[PDB]
């Protein structure tokens, strides 16, 4: 399952659900929104 916002994502494997237009990052070591 794809986690939402404020979720410890992975630099290599992006789990950021694309349904809510998200893009995992490494700066904050978690998932945030995309524009």
């Amino acid at each position: 399952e794809c986690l939402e916002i404020f979720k410890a994502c992975n630099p290599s494997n992006d789990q950021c659900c694309k349904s809510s237009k998200l893009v995992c990052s490494r700066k904050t070591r978690w998932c945030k929104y995309q524009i």
């Binding site: 904050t28 945030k32 929104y33 995309q34 524009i35």
Partner: protein, 226 residues
Amino acid sequence: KMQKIVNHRAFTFTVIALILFNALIVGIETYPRIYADHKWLFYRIDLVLLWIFTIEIAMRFLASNPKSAFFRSSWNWFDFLIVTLSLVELFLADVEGLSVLRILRVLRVLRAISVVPSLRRLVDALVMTIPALGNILILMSIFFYIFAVIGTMLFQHVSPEYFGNLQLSLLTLFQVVTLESWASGVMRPIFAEVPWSWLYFVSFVLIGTFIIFNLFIGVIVNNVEK
């Protein structure tokens, strides 16, 4: 119900200490050597500081007449906006840095003016006395505009670096009212081609000064009197 006296000298000095510490850390982080190494440490310190400031503003909000406005004080607005924009880096889009978010962390230092009673008291008047000026600012603006338009339409082909545009020359006219080599870098090389230009600068440097000077005197008989 948060109706106890939770904000006293000790809490205020905790706040002040945190502000000074954030100032020191933002200063340090401007060294490349000292930064590359402890990057992780600096980032996590910044995170903790951000949270401890957010909960600070939150306590400030709640503990004091929540249903009441609380938004009268411009200061509280300042703190609010700073914390908001700084958090947005966590819950919004793509606002990493790009030479614009770090300025926010730095500006976070101004709260040192909000805390210290004397500083706030001073800045209050130092601002309120702007509308006192009022007119004189409009006069200087009109003069700047006239002289900028004329300088453009005249010297736009002789000195394209100082009088190239309506604004490129609005900058020259600003450097010339502070008297920075307006005779050795700005005029002396123009006066060599259009020989009647000595009017333009001289005239400006007089009126400009004459205006500025009087502004000065003005704000005296508005203060030294009372």
